[PDB]
Amino acid sequence: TGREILEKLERREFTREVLKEALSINDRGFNEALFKLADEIRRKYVGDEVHIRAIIEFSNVCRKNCLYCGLRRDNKNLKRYRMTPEEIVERARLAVQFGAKTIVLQSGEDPYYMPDVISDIVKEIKKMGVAVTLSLGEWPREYYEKWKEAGADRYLLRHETANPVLHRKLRPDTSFENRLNCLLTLKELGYETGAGSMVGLPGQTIDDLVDDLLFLKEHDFDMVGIGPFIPHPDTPLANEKKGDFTLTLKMVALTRILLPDSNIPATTAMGTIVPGGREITLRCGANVIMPNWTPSPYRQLYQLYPGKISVFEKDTASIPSVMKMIELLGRKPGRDWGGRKRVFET
Ligand SMILES: C[C@H](CCC(=O)NCCC[N+](C)(C)CCCS(=O)(=O)[O-])[C@H]1CC[C@H]2[C@@H]3[C@H](O)C[C@@H]4C[C@H](O)CC[C@]4(C)[C@H]3C[C@H](O)[C@]12C
Ligand SMILES: C[C@H](CCC(=O)NCCC[N+](C)(C)CCCS(=O)(=O)[O-])[C@H]1CC[C@H]2[C@@H]3[C@H](O)C[C@@H]4C[C@H](O)CC[C@]4(C)[C@H]3C[C@H](O)[C@]12C
Ligand SMILES: Nc1ncnc2c1ncn2[C@@H]1O[C@H](CSCC[C@H](N)C(=O)O)[C@@H](O)[C@H]1O
Ligand SMILES: */O=C(\[O])[C@]1([C])[N][C](C([O])=O)[C]S1
Ligand code: SF4
Ligand SMILES: [Cl-]
């Protein structure tokens, strides 16, 4: 029964079977109660502040060939771009002028910048008195060390899928073992570390989703980014089914229940698959939003999946828009960098 699974979630009995059953029950009443539980846990542990992370997608060049991703190297039907270091720093400064307290630098795995150009950019942005998060993919330990010395605070490296077999199939350049080793290295070097997964990948099962939740709980990540798989027409997965929004939302809710003090974004992919999806997600366990700060004419070229929102508006619209969102949700913008504030418990 749903009521018993809720009770067990409330008492923190996070067994495999309780998670499977939560993910398998499709009853509306159960789902709504699960979302209310996550919302309430969010409020109690991380409060009403919604932390704004301004993301600059500074290059869409990638050396990898992930099957799901529109930036994969085999996609010849994409105009590739690279922002200059000066452009990146000045665009970051503009976001800080607009009130961002974290700058996220994201790219394809583009060798050009690595490691020294990144280091230089990080140092310049850190002078602005904000947190810096990197989301650059898999690189040697030495690169991660250089970036940490340069002042980077956080690193986002979604684990994608905790099924090693599925991982290697979808990400043929690498492996789950490699991805995990990167995540462990980042944690050792003192980054606030983010992981997370896609929901509704071709071949992914409900037991796989359970294993994603258990993986996340085991390593106690600071941030967890979850969104649905959205097929891209210039990829091998073009004809596969999109991930289900509701199931994805349940994954966010369960993540908050499992990791009550973590930082959990309402991802752009959630807002792409359903109009108003980020706002829903912020009411079902999430506490972070990542407005797109990539400038025109590049923004529209950073196409991991189609239909991405925030492309038609002026390139400074997103920060004001999320501030309006936060207000209409009855929430508050973050006052500090929004680092993880651990609540030690039993
Ligand atoms: C806004 C709609 C529809 C509400 C509605 O329209 N219900 C009828 C009117 C009720 N009023 C009290 C306004 C008047 C009553 C007198 S009347 O004469 O109208 O009958 C309600 C119906 C179900 C609600 C969600 C679920 O909970 C799950 C979840 C819990 C989290 O925590 C917050 C997020 C989320 C997604 C909820 C958001 C929102 O809250 C929803 C969509
Ligand atoms: C960038 C330009 C020119 C002046 C400038 O370069 N300003 C640097 C401000 C730096 N900070 C954000 C760190 C100040 C924090 C002050 S605070 O008292 O909010 O802590 C300034 C002038 C007016 C400012 C907007 C309005 O105000 C309304 C609104 C308030 C929100 O809040 C943040 C978003 C928004 C849209 C503002 C963004 C930005 O800022 C604007 C465009
Ligand atoms: N088709 C698609 N649908 C939904 N999310 C996708 C997607 N393609 C990629 N993503 C997400 O986009 C993220 C950013 S890729 C850029 C960061 C870095 N190269 C890296 O891979 O870590 C990936 O973590 C993945 O979860
Ligand atoms: O999960 C995240 O941190 C990011 C930044 N959100 C992006 C999206 O498109 O939803 C991809 S990773
Ligand atoms: S998911 Fe990241 S590493 Fe993989 S192809 Fe896309 S940009 Fe490159
Ligand atoms: Cl961050």
Closest atom of ligand 1 to CA, residue 32 = 28
E strand segments, the chain = 49-59, 102-107, 131-135, 154-156, 192-195, 198-199, 223-224, 227-228, 288-289, 332-333
DSSP letter at 113 equals G
Taken in order of first residue, the domains within the chain and their CATH numbers are 1-346 (3.20.20.70)
Distance 330 CA to ligand 1 centre (A): 15
Q: Which of 236, 232, 264 has its CA nearest to residue 248?
A: 264
- Ligand 3: residue whose CA is nearest its atom 20: 137
Report which bound ligand comes closest to the CA of 250: 1
Q: Which of 96, 95, 155, 86 has its CA nearest to residue 120?
A: 86
Which helix (H) or strand (E) element contains residue 126? Answer: helix 116-126
Q: How far apart are CA 281 and CA 248, in angstroms?
A: 9
Do the beta carbons of residue 284 and residue 35 sit within 8 Å?
Answer: yes
Q: How far apart are CA 153 and CA 312, in angstroms?
A: 31
After which residues does the chain become discontinuous at a C–N distance over 2.5 Å? none
Distance 309 CA to ligand 4 centre (A): 12
- Vertex 137: Cα angle to 168 and 122 (nearest 5): 175
Tokens of 248: 């994805």
Look at strands 154-156 and 192-195 and give their pairing.
parallel
- Ligand 3: residue whose CA is nearest its atom 4: 229
Q: Which of 217, 203, 206, 303 has its CA nearest to residue 248?
A: 206
Q: Which of 60, 63, 68, 71 for mutating ligand 5's site (highest number of atoms within 8 Å of CB)?
A: 71
Work out the angle between the directed axes of helices 141-150 and 176-188 (0-180°, nearest 10). 30
The experimental method is X-ray
Closest atom of ligand 3 to CA, residue 136 = 18
Do the beta carbons of residue 58 and residue 117 sit within 8 Å?
Answer: no
Do the beta carbons of residue 190 and residue 235 sit within 8 Å?
Answer: no
Resolution (A): 1.2
DSSP letter at 157 equals -
